[PDB]
Amino acid sequence: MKGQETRGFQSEVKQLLHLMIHSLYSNKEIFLRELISNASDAADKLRFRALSNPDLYEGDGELRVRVSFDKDKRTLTISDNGVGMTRDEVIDHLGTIAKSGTKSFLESSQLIGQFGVGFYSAFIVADKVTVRTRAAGEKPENGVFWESAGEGEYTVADITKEDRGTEITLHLREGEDEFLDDWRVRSIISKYSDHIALPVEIEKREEKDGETVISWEKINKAQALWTRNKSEITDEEYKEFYKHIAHDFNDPLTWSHNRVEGKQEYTSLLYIPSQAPWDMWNRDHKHGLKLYVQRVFIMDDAEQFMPNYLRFVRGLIDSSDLPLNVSREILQDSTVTRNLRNALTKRVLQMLEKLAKDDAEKYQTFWQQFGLVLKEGPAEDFANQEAIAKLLRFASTHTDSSAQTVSLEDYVSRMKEGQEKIYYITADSYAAAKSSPHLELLRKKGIEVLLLSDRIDEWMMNYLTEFDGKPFQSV
Amino acid sequence: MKGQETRGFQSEVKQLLHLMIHSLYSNKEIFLRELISNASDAADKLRFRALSNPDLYEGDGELRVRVSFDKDKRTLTISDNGVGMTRDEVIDHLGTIAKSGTKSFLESSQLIGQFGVGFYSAFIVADKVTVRTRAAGEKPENGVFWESAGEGEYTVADITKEDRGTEITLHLREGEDEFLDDWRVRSIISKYSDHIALPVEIEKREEKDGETVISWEKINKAQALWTRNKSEITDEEYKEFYKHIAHDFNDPLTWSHNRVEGKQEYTSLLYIPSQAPWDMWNRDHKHGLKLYVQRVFIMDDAEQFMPNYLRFVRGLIDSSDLPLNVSREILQDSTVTRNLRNALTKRVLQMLEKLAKDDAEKYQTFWQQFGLVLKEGPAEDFANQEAIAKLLRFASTHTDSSAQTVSLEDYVSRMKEGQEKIYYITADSYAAAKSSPHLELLRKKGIEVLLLSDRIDEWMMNYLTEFDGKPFQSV
Ligand SMILES: Nc1ncnc2c1ncn2[C@@H]1O[C@H](COP(=O)(O)OP(=O)(O)O)[C@@H](O)[C@H]1O
Ligand SMILES: Nc1ncnc2c1ncn2[C@@H]1O[C@H](COP(=O)(O)OP(=O)(O)O)[C@@H](O)[C@H]1O
Ligand SMILES: [Mg+2]
Ligand SMILES: [Mg+2]
């Protein structure tokens, strides 16, 4: 094992780790979920490359993730046999962190703020993590090694490893002996893996005379979630699975699992978040559905199936109309895309309509988080303009608040005589529109006024020129 | 009085009449409404022609219908200075009709059923009707006289009418003296004239010392009803106005009044008849919106603003983006037209939908009447397949009738944890269909199956294979 080198974590990473830790000891069972989520992602990566060249499965073609513990060495080990990593990859992915989290770090009993990051979840429970990975296809003499007390630096070196995949060993802190108990760990892997197609085995040791008797019984049922029938899939499974594909700690507000067989044979499973991603307002930001084909994972962040004013959506698409060779290029100049695209655009509005009716408190959350993104909507897609206006919420004079708790239908159902219109006011701050003008001309008569004060509102009212009869007019 | 000639009525007019007099004696006050209504139509015609050739108003350009009565002679006279008629016009329009069906089988509690008023309603109240008229642009020696007792024949002749227009005189049947009363008559006009733009003036007679001064004073507000604000229009006015522009005694199921103003500047006012016209099915029937350009009437029965799937929609449409020259032709290749046929097509649907929600009984009534034509829809309007389907209804398996009670939105409210479904079934009448194959098992599960029996159902199904969320299918 020669080639030892030591690096420094991005100045902001130490700021994440040490922070995230205290912030999550409330939910520490997490790491075990995040590693499996990753073992799963590592398996799809393999099956993908394997399409192109089916020899990467050199030997075993049955992917799986194994858990086990040295009650004596105080360790827990999770080892899958997926793509595995390359040394240069090890340094890119593990060594760093592709995303962001600095402009907010210096701000703000389960203290969370805004989710940490998958893999490092491990340090909430381990004071030393070790990885030994051997990339798919490559040589067993180029296995890598990554060690880190997570204090501030980490180490890499080259090693050998016959088997392919990734082996992660966590050296538990003191007062974590829970994860060295069969029922406890078993319980957790049980709880965190139903949404996962990858079989999840767990080490079983039995003393049947002679030597020792090792096994690996799977706790996992194993079944691509979007494959089974809604009728049998529970909400627990629907929620964690979202977390899985969304790479987010929080839960979702709702979901639309749908199968379709006709002109567009696909099978979507979109999700509606609950918190807006911290990096949602800067150009380079991941958005798009996890694209599948013939149940074969292909690409991620494929934005070409969702119109811009719906970036915030999340989920997969198990199409069958797309060629198994779909590229990032092909997709953009595809008709089956443009079709699927619009066919799904509606499914999100339908999912939203259904939401706003069943749980308003959940919908209000939705509105707050993704308010200004849905608004730039009827400004370049009048196709569905009505459904998109109904989904819209505003701040009215009926409420003695800045609370965007009013639907346009709420506004109509409370009109009077001397009607014909929905009057608004376009200011800057809620204050600059609730008292700073001349709505009083109307207040003296008893007519409702929509107090709009969000930067985009003015530009939006140039495309929204009426809502079911009653036209819109400024004051 | 030269040219004197008597003529006989067509065979069903002598029938239509006698039948009409008893069927409508409940509403005798009705004739007064129909003469002013016609007087108004004359004022329109004139202004229309007046465009191309302003000589027509020859000097007297203040249009108005004047009502008066005489107690000792016992007559009620109505006279307008509208377009007036010529001898050939008279004979064509007054001596005949264009509204058949063939019955009168009910002879040998009011009996209305389904039939057309118009001019003849005058006989309900009058045992003799006289008409002196002289069309615009015609030497006064070209006046025309028409007189009939509604008994079977009529008399035409030439007279000299220096005045332009039409003077109608009724000799009231005995026991009709309640129409010689200034207050009863003055109340009827008022009730039937405030939804009419043509000033309606009533006569006045006084005793100014040995002399007799004849006043005339408007009783009317005289304003195009689609020009006023939705708020100042009584539901009564909307329904009278309906009878006006639709030439139908029956009230409408609903209406939609809208003043669009932006790219497309127009004013629409549509309605949905309480019952399909007797002569509907017969491609040689007149459907259409009455068309006005710059508050000037131009033409009736213009088909170009409503798709064949919504031909039954009565109503008018004032416009501003069209030229005071539109003709049955230009509309064919005009873009402003098409854009309205769309903007409006998508306004009928909203009215239809607000109908299936404010009074579900009228919608049913509507469905029984025109459903069959609203079905031929999704086979041509793909852009509105959403609202269309949300409208149309069928007979189920949960229903004890051929009666089309069930809507597609309540088959989902009454759909269970069984699956993704909206099963339908074809055949002929409700008969050879409710008792046929593979409907048994779907039953053993407690599932419903929309039973189709309409000659078109299967064809129409083809184009509507979606309906929000749940996907369609046969059995
Ligand atoms: N078991 C594994 N096999 C291969 N790559 C892995 C594995 N675990 C983690 N990785 C790599 O680490 C990267 C970052 O991990 P993570 O912190 O969980 O964020 P994310 O996985 O969502 O990208 C992944 O993109 C992947 O390249
Ligand atoms: N006062 C009038 N001035 C001119 N033409 C008239 C007048 N009254 C009736 N007419 C003509 O005679 C026809 C007969 O009247 P009516 O029974 O009401 O049929 P309609 O419903 O089309 O008016 C009218 O359509 C019109 O052509
Ligand atoms: Mg991850
Ligand atoms: Mg008439």
Short mmCIF file of N, CA and C in Angstrom, two decimals, chain B residues 101-223:
data_model
loop_
_atom_site.label_atom_id
_atom_site.label_comp_id
_atom_site.label_asym_id
_atom_site.label_seq_id
_atom_site.Cartn_x
_atom_site.Cartn_y
_atom_site.Cartn_z
N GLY B 101 -92.59 21.17 -39.29
CA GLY B 101 -92.58 19.95 -38.52
C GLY B 101 -94.00 19.64 -38.94
N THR B 102 -94.52 18.45 -38.70
CA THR B 102 -95.89 18.23 -39.14
C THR B 102 -96.64 17.42 -38.12
N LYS B 103 -97.60 18.08 -37.49
CA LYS B 103 -98.37 17.43 -36.45
C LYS B 103 -99.85 17.81 -36.44
N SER B 104 -100.26 18.65 -35.48
CA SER B 104 -101.66 19.06 -35.34
C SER B 104 -102.51 17.82 -35.03
N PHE B 105 -101.82 16.75 -34.62
CA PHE B 105 -102.43 15.45 -34.29
C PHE B 105 -103.07 15.44 -32.89
N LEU B 106 -102.78 16.47 -32.11
CA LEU B 106 -103.27 16.58 -30.73
C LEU B 106 -104.75 16.98 -30.56
N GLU B 107 -105.45 17.24 -31.66
CA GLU B 107 -106.86 17.64 -31.54
C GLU B 107 -107.85 16.52 -31.89
N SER B 108 -109.12 16.93 -32.05
CA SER B 108 -110.25 16.05 -32.38
C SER B 108 -110.58 15.04 -31.27
N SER B 109 -104.51 24.59 -17.73
CA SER B 109 -103.66 23.72 -18.61
C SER B 109 -103.34 24.39 -19.96
N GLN B 110 -102.09 24.80 -20.12
CA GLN B 110 -101.60 25.45 -21.33
C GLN B 110 -100.89 24.39 -22.19
N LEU B 111 -100.92 24.56 -23.51
CA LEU B 111 -100.25 23.60 -24.39
C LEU B 111 -99.17 24.32 -25.21
N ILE B 112 -97.97 24.50 -24.64
CA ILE B 112 -96.89 25.18 -25.37
C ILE B 112 -95.99 24.21 -26.12
N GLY B 113 -95.41 23.26 -25.39
CA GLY B 113 -94.52 22.28 -26.00
C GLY B 113 -93.26 22.90 -26.58
N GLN B 114 -93.31 23.25 -27.87
CA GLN B 114 -92.14 23.84 -28.53
C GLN B 114 -92.43 24.76 -29.72
N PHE B 115 -93.11 25.90 -29.58
CA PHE B 115 -93.24 26.65 -30.81
C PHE B 115 -93.23 28.16 -30.97
N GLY B 116 -92.70 28.50 -32.14
CA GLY B 116 -92.48 29.84 -32.63
C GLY B 116 -93.59 30.87 -32.73
N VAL B 117 -93.29 31.99 -32.09
CA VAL B 117 -94.14 33.17 -32.02
C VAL B 117 -93.89 34.00 -33.29
N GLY B 118 -93.41 35.22 -33.08
CA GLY B 118 -93.14 36.12 -34.18
C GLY B 118 -94.37 36.97 -34.39
N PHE B 119 -94.45 37.57 -35.58
CA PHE B 119 -95.55 38.42 -36.00
C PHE B 119 -96.96 37.89 -35.64
N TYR B 120 -97.27 36.68 -36.07
CA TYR B 120 -98.58 36.10 -35.83
C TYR B 120 -99.11 36.15 -34.41
N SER B 121 -98.22 36.21 -33.41
CA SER B 121 -98.72 36.26 -32.04
C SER B 121 -99.79 37.35 -31.87
N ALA B 122 -99.76 38.37 -32.72
CA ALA B 122 -100.76 39.44 -32.66
C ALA B 122 -102.20 38.92 -32.66
N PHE B 123 -102.45 37.79 -33.33
CA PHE B 123 -103.82 37.29 -33.39
C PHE B 123 -104.31 36.75 -32.07
N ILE B 124 -103.39 36.47 -31.15
CA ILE B 124 -103.82 35.96 -29.86
C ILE B 124 -104.79 37.00 -29.30
N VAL B 125 -104.41 38.25 -29.49
CA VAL B 125 -105.13 39.40 -28.98
C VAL B 125 -106.01 40.15 -29.98
N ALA B 126 -105.66 40.06 -31.26
CA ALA B 126 -106.41 40.80 -32.28
C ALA B 126 -107.19 39.95 -33.26
N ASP B 127 -108.43 40.35 -33.54
CA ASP B 127 -109.24 39.60 -34.48
C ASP B 127 -109.08 40.18 -35.88
N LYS B 128 -108.08 41.03 -36.07
CA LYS B 128 -107.77 41.61 -37.39
C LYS B 128 -106.48 42.41 -37.33
N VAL B 129 -105.55 42.13 -38.23
CA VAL B 129 -104.31 42.87 -38.21
C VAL B 129 -104.12 43.55 -39.53
N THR B 130 -103.71 44.82 -39.51
CA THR B 130 -103.50 45.61 -40.73
C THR B 130 -102.04 46.10 -40.78
N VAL B 131 -101.47 46.23 -41.97
CA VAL B 131 -100.11 46.70 -42.08
C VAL B 131 -99.96 47.62 -43.28
N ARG B 132 -99.44 48.82 -43.06
CA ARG B 132 -99.16 49.78 -44.12
C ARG B 132 -97.65 49.93 -43.94
N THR B 133 -96.90 49.81 -45.02
CA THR B 133 -95.44 49.86 -44.95
C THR B 133 -94.86 50.34 -46.29
N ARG B 134 -93.74 51.07 -46.23
CA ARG B 134 -93.10 51.59 -47.44
C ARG B 134 -91.59 51.54 -47.23
N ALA B 135 -90.92 50.62 -47.92
CA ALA B 135 -89.48 50.43 -47.74
C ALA B 135 -88.59 51.61 -48.07
N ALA B 136 -87.39 51.59 -47.48
CA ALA B 136 -86.42 52.67 -47.68
C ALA B 136 -85.98 52.74 -49.13
N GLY B 137 -85.82 53.96 -49.64
CA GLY B 137 -85.43 54.14 -51.03
C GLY B 137 -86.55 53.52 -51.86
N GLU B 138 -87.66 54.24 -51.94
CA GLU B 138 -88.84 53.79 -52.65
C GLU B 138 -89.79 54.98 -52.73
N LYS B 139 -90.29 55.29 -53.93
CA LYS B 139 -91.22 56.40 -54.03
C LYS B 139 -92.41 56.03 -53.12
N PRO B 140 -92.96 57.01 -52.38
CA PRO B 140 -94.10 56.74 -51.49
C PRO B 140 -95.30 56.04 -52.15
N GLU B 141 -95.33 56.01 -53.48
CA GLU B 141 -96.42 55.35 -54.20
C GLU B 141 -96.16 53.86 -54.19
N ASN B 142 -95.01 53.47 -53.65
CA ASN B 142 -94.64 52.07 -53.53
C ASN B 142 -94.90 51.54 -52.11
N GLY B 143 -95.86 52.14 -51.43
CA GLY B 143 -96.17 51.65 -50.10
C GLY B 143 -96.89 50.33 -50.33
N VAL B 144 -97.05 49.53 -49.28
CA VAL B 144 -97.76 48.26 -49.37
C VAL B 144 -98.75 48.11 -48.24
N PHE B 145 -99.90 47.54 -48.56
CA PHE B 145 -100.96 47.33 -47.58
C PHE B 145 -101.14 45.85 -47.47
N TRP B 146 -101.34 45.36 -46.24
CA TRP B 146 -101.56 43.93 -45.94
C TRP B 146 -102.60 43.91 -44.84
N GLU B 147 -103.59 43.03 -44.96
CA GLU B 147 -104.65 42.93 -43.95
C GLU B 147 -105.10 41.49 -43.90
N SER B 148 -105.32 40.96 -42.71
CA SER B 148 -105.77 39.58 -42.57
C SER B 148 -106.49 39.35 -41.27
N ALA B 149 -107.38 38.37 -41.25
CA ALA B 149 -108.14 38.06 -40.04
C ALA B 149 -107.63 36.80 -39.36
N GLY B 150 -106.47 36.31 -39.80
CA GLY B 150 -105.90 35.11 -39.22
C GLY B 150 -106.79 33.89 -39.40
N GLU B 151 -107.79 34.01 -40.26
CA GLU B 151 -108.73 32.92 -40.51
C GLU B 151 -108.32 31.98 -41.64
N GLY B 152 -107.43 32.42 -42.53
CA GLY B 152 -107.01 31.55 -43.61
C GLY B 152 -106.49 32.28 -44.83
N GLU B 153 -106.85 33.55 -44.97
CA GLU B 153 -106.41 34.34 -46.11
C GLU B 153 -105.89 35.70 -45.68
N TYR B 154 -105.27 36.41 -46.60
CA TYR B 154 -104.76 37.75 -46.34
C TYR B 154 -104.93 38.58 -47.61
N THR B 155 -104.84 39.90 -47.49
CA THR B 155 -105.04 40.79 -48.62
C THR B 155 -103.88 41.73 -48.85
N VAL B 156 -103.33 41.75 -50.05
CA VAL B 156 -102.22 42.66 -50.33
C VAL B 156 -102.74 43.76 -51.25
N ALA B 157 -102.08 44.91 -51.26
CA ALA B 157 -102.47 46.03 -52.13
C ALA B 157 -101.42 47.14 -52.09
N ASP B 158 -101.53 48.09 -53.03
CA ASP B 158 -100.58 49.19 -53.09
C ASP B 158 -101.19 50.45 -52.52
N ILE B 159 -100.40 51.19 -51.76
CA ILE B 159 -100.90 52.42 -51.18
C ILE B 159 -99.80 53.43 -51.28
N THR B 160 -100.08 54.62 -50.81
CA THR B 160 -99.10 55.69 -50.83
C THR B 160 -98.75 56.03 -49.39
N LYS B 161 -97.57 55.63 -48.96
CA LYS B 161 -97.16 55.92 -47.62
C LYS B 161 -96.00 56.90 -47.71
N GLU B 162 -96.25 58.18 -47.47
CA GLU B 162 -95.16 59.13 -47.54
C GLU B 162 -94.11 58.80 -46.45
N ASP B 163 -94.56 58.29 -45.30
CA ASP B 163 -93.68 57.95 -44.16
C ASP B 163 -92.87 56.69 -44.44
N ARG B 164 -91.60 56.64 -44.04
CA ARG B 164 -90.81 55.41 -44.24
C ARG B 164 -90.95 54.46 -43.05
N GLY B 165 -91.13 53.17 -43.31
CA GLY B 165 -91.24 52.23 -42.22
C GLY B 165 -92.41 51.27 -42.23
N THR B 166 -92.94 50.99 -41.05
CA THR B 166 -94.03 50.05 -40.91
C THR B 166 -95.00 50.47 -39.85
N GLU B 167 -96.28 50.54 -40.20
CA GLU B 167 -97.30 50.91 -39.26
C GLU B 167 -98.18 49.68 -39.14
N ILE B 168 -98.22 49.09 -37.94
CA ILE B 168 -99.00 47.89 -37.67
C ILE B 168 -100.19 48.31 -36.84
N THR B 169 -101.39 47.82 -37.18
CA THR B 169 -102.61 48.15 -36.43
C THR B 169 -103.39 46.90 -36.11
N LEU B 170 -103.73 46.73 -34.83
CA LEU B 170 -104.48 45.58 -34.40
C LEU B 170 -105.86 46.04 -33.96
N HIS B 171 -106.89 45.27 -34.31
CA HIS B 171 -108.26 45.57 -33.89
C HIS B 171 -108.44 44.50 -32.86
N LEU B 172 -108.48 44.90 -31.60
CA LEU B 172 -108.55 43.97 -30.49
C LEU B 172 -109.78 43.10 -30.47
N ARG B 173 -109.61 41.82 -30.10
CA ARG B 173 -110.75 40.91 -29.99
C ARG B 173 -111.60 41.44 -28.86
N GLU B 174 -112.89 41.13 -28.85
CA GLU B 174 -113.76 41.61 -27.78
C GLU B 174 -113.37 40.96 -26.45
N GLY B 175 -113.18 41.79 -25.43
CA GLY B 175 -112.77 41.31 -24.12
C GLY B 175 -111.28 41.51 -23.98
N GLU B 176 -110.74 42.44 -24.76
CA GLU B 176 -109.31 42.73 -24.74
C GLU B 176 -109.07 44.19 -24.41
N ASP B 177 -110.11 44.85 -23.93
CA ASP B 177 -110.05 46.27 -23.59
C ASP B 177 -108.97 46.66 -22.57
N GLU B 178 -108.31 45.67 -21.99
CA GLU B 178 -107.27 45.94 -21.01
C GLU B 178 -106.02 46.44 -21.72
N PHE B 179 -106.08 46.57 -23.05
CA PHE B 179 -104.94 47.04 -23.84
C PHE B 179 -105.24 48.43 -24.39
N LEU B 180 -106.25 49.07 -23.82
CA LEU B 180 -106.61 50.41 -24.23
C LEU B 180 -106.34 51.29 -23.01
N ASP B 181 -105.89 50.62 -21.94
CA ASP B 181 -105.56 51.25 -20.67
C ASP B 181 -104.11 51.76 -20.71
N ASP B 182 -103.94 53.07 -20.60
CA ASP B 182 -102.60 53.64 -20.65
C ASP B 182 -101.61 52.98 -19.68
N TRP B 183 -102.03 52.71 -18.44
CA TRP B 183 -101.14 52.07 -17.46
C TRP B 183 -100.78 50.59 -17.71
N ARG B 184 -101.73 49.79 -18.18
CA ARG B 184 -101.43 48.37 -18.45
C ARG B 184 -100.51 48.27 -19.65
N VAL B 185 -100.86 49.01 -20.69
CA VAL B 185 -100.05 49.04 -21.90
C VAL B 185 -98.67 49.66 -21.60
N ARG B 186 -98.68 50.83 -20.96
CA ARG B 186 -97.44 51.50 -20.62
C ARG B 186 -96.54 50.65 -19.73
N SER B 187 -97.13 49.71 -18.99
CA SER B 187 -96.32 48.83 -18.14
C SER B 187 -95.71 47.69 -18.94
N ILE B 188 -96.46 47.17 -19.92
CA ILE B 188 -96.00 46.07 -20.77
C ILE B 188 -94.81 46.51 -21.63
N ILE B 189 -94.95 47.64 -22.33
CA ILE B 189 -93.85 48.16 -23.16
C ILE B 189 -92.58 48.16 -22.29
N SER B 190 -92.62 49.01 -21.26
CA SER B 190 -91.55 49.18 -20.29
C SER B 190 -90.92 47.85 -19.92
N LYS B 191 -91.76 46.89 -19.57
CA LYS B 191 -91.27 45.57 -19.20
C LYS B 191 -90.55 44.90 -20.39
N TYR B 192 -91.00 45.15 -21.62
CA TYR B 192 -90.38 44.52 -22.78
C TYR B 192 -89.45 45.40 -23.62
N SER B 193 -89.20 46.62 -23.17
CA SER B 193 -88.37 47.52 -23.95
C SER B 193 -87.06 47.99 -23.36
N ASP B 194 -86.85 47.82 -22.07
CA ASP B 194 -85.60 48.29 -21.51
C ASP B 194 -84.37 47.43 -21.86
N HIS B 195 -84.58 46.33 -22.58
CA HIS B 195 -83.45 45.49 -23.02
C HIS B 195 -83.24 45.68 -24.53
N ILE B 196 -83.92 46.69 -25.07
CA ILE B 196 -83.87 47.04 -26.48
C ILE B 196 -83.27 48.44 -26.68
N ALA B 197 -82.36 48.55 -27.65
CA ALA B 197 -81.66 49.80 -27.95
C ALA B 197 -82.49 50.84 -28.69
N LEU B 198 -83.47 50.38 -29.44
CA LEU B 198 -84.31 51.29 -30.19
C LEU B 198 -85.21 52.06 -29.24
N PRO B 199 -85.20 53.40 -29.31
CA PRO B 199 -86.09 54.12 -28.39
C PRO B 199 -87.53 53.67 -28.62
N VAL B 200 -88.25 53.41 -27.54
CA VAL B 200 -89.65 53.01 -27.67
C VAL B 200 -90.46 54.15 -27.06
N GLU B 201 -91.25 54.83 -27.88
CA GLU B 201 -92.02 55.97 -27.40
C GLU B 201 -93.53 55.68 -27.35
N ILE B 202 -94.23 56.15 -26.32
CA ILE B 202 -95.67 55.92 -26.30
C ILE B 202 -96.40 57.23 -26.60
N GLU B 203 -97.58 57.14 -27.20
CA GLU B 203 -98.34 58.34 -27.54
C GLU B 203 -98.96 58.95 -26.32
N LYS B 204 -99.42 60.18 -26.47
CA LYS B 204 -100.09 60.92 -25.42
C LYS B 204 -101.03 61.84 -26.14
N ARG B 205 -102.20 62.03 -25.56
CA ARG B 205 -103.19 62.87 -26.18
C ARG B 205 -103.79 63.77 -25.13
N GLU B 206 -103.89 65.06 -25.44
CA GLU B 206 -104.46 65.99 -24.49
C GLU B 206 -105.48 66.97 -25.04
N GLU B 207 -106.05 67.73 -24.11
CA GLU B 207 -107.09 68.71 -24.38
C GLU B 207 -106.63 70.16 -24.24
N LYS B 208 -105.60 70.57 -24.98
CA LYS B 208 -105.10 71.94 -24.87
C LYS B 208 -106.00 73.02 -25.48
N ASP B 209 -107.14 73.24 -24.83
CA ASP B 209 -108.12 74.26 -25.22
C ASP B 209 -108.63 74.15 -26.65
N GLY B 210 -109.75 73.45 -26.84
CA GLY B 210 -110.32 73.30 -28.16
C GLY B 210 -109.48 72.52 -29.17
N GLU B 211 -108.17 72.46 -28.92
CA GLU B 211 -107.23 71.74 -29.79
C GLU B 211 -106.82 70.41 -29.13
N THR B 212 -106.15 69.56 -29.90
CA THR B 212 -105.69 68.27 -29.40
C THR B 212 -104.21 68.13 -29.70
N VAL B 213 -103.39 68.12 -28.66
CA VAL B 213 -101.94 68.01 -28.83
C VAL B 213 -101.47 66.58 -28.62
N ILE B 214 -100.76 66.06 -29.61
CA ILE B 214 -100.24 64.70 -29.54
C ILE B 214 -98.77 64.66 -29.14
N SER B 215 -98.50 64.25 -27.91
CA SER B 215 -97.13 64.12 -27.43
C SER B 215 -96.69 62.69 -27.76
N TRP B 216 -95.43 62.39 -27.48
CA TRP B 216 -94.85 61.07 -27.66
C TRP B 216 -93.70 61.13 -26.65
N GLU B 217 -93.56 60.13 -25.80
CA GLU B 217 -92.44 60.23 -24.89
C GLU B 217 -91.79 58.89 -24.65
N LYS B 218 -90.47 58.84 -24.82
CA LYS B 218 -89.72 57.61 -24.62
C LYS B 218 -90.01 56.99 -23.23
N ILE B 219 -90.11 55.67 -23.19
CA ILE B 219 -90.38 54.94 -21.96
C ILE B 219 -89.15 54.09 -21.72
N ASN B 220 -88.32 54.09 -22.74
CA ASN B 220 -87.12 53.30 -22.85
C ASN B 220 -85.83 53.98 -22.39
N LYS B 221 -84.86 53.16 -22.00
CA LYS B 221 -83.54 53.67 -21.60
C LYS B 221 -82.73 53.70 -22.91
N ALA B 222 -83.17 52.90 -23.88
CA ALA B 222 -82.55 52.85 -25.20
C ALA B 222 -81.03 52.69 -25.26
N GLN B 223 -80.51 51.53 -24.84
CA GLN B 223 -79.07 51.26 -24.87
C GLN B 223 -78.82 49.80 -25.21
#
